[PDB]
């Protein structure tokens, strides 16, 4: 059979189903986006600009 | 002259009463006669809270604040003497009324402070 590094080589052929996994890379990468912005959110201390910014934190 | 069933549920119970544009004049005080405050009305329309800054010797300011528990701010019916003193100057004596009110106001990025609003004794 395919070996595991080659899994994906099944797309080659299937435009559809191509675009379905570009989808789901997607999602993951927007998945990501917002999930990460969730957290700096969730730890992010907005009270001093000055000596606190956000590249500090 | 409104009733209570005009005023109930507009807001309207939480605001002081209001005088016109034409109440300029002046109001005689003779020092002979004793006065009192029969109704005295604060309706607070801002709340502002001094910020803690980290290094202790920048200016603080007062800041902007969001009232979060609505429109049961206002301090009401209350009386107290009028005094008038040998200089000419009044002191007005609180002696009773709804003269407090917990307010809690919300910082920016949500810190809640609560406060006793009142002008007691
Ligand atoms: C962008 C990500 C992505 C996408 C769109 C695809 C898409 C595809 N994969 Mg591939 N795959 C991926 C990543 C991806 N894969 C990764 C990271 C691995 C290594 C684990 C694989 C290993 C793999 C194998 C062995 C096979 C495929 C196959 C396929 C095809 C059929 C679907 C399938 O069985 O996947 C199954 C893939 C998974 C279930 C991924 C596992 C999820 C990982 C382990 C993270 C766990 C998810 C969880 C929410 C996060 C945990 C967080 C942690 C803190 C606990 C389809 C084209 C099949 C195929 O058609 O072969 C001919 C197939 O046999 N994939
Ligand atoms: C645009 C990016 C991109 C895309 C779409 C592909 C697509 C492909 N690669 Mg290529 N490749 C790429 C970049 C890419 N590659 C890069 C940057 C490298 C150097 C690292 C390679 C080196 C490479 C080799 C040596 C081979 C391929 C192969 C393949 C084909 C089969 C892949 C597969 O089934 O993996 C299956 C993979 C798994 C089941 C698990 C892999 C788990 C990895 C190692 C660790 C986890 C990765 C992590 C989840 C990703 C995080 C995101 C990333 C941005 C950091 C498929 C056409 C194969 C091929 O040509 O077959 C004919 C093959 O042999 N690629
Ligand atoms: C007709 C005009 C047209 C338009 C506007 C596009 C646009 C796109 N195509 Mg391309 N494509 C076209 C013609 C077109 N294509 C033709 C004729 C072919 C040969 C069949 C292809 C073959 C092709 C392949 C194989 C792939 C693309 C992909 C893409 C997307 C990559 C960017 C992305 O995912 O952003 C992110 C998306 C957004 C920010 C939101 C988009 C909002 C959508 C478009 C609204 C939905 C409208 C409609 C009902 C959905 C399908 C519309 C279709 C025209 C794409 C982008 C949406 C890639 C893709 O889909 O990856 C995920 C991809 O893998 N195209
Ligand atoms: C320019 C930006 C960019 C590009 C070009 C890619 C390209 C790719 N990503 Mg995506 N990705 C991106 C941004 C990008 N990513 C971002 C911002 C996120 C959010 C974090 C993701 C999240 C993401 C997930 C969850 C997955 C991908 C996967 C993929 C691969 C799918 C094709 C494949 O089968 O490769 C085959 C695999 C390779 C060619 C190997 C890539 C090895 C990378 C470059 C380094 C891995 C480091 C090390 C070996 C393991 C990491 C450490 C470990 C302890 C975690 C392709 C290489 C999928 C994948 O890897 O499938 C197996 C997959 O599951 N990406
Ligand atoms: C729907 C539209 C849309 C909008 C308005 C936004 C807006 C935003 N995104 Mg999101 N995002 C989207 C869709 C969108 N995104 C999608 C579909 C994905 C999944 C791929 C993401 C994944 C994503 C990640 C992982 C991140 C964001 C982030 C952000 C923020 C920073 C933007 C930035 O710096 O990019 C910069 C963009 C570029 C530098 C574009 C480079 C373009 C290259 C050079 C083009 C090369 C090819 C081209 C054909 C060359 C020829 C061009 C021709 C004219 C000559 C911004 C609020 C960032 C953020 O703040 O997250 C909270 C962030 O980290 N987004
Ligand atoms: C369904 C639906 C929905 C929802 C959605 C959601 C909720 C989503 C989520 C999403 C998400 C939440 C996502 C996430 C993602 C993530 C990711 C994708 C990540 C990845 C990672 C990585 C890849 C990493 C790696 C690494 C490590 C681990 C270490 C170091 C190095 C590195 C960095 C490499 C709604 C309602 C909207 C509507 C429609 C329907
Ligand atoms: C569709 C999916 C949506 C999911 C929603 C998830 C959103 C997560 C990020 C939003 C920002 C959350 O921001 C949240 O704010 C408060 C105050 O800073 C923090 O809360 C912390 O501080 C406050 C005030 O000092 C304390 O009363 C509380 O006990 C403490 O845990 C949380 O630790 C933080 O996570
Ligand atoms: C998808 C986003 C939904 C979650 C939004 C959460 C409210 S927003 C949240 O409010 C907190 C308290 O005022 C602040 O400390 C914090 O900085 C702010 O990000």
């Known amino acids: ?57 | 002259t409104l009733t209570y069933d005009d005023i109930v549920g507009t807001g309207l119970a939480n605001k002081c009463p209001t005088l016109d544009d034409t109440a300029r004049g002046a109001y005689p005080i003779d020092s002979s006669q004793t006065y009192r405050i029969a109704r005295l009305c604060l309706q607070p329309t801002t709340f502002l809270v001094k910020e803690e800054p980290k290094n202790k010797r920048q200016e603080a300011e007062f800041v902007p604040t969001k009232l979060v528990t609505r429109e049961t701010t206002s301090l009401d019916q209350i009386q107290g003497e009028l005094k008038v003193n040998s200089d000419g100057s009044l002191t007005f004596v609180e002696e009773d009324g709804i003269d407090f009110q917990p307010v809690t106001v919300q910082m920016a990025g949500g810190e809640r402070i609560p406060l006793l609003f009142t002008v007691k004794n």
């Not at chain 1, 927007?30 to 969730?42: F, H, K, N, R, T």
């Open chain 1, 1 to 57: 059979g395919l070996p595991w590094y080659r899994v994906h080589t099944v797309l080659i052929n299937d435009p559809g189903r191509l675009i379905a996994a570009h989808l789901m890379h997607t999602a993951l990468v927007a998945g990501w986006a917002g999930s990460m912005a969730l957290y700096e959110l969730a730890t992010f201390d907005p009270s001093d600009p000055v000596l606190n910014p956000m590249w500090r934190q």
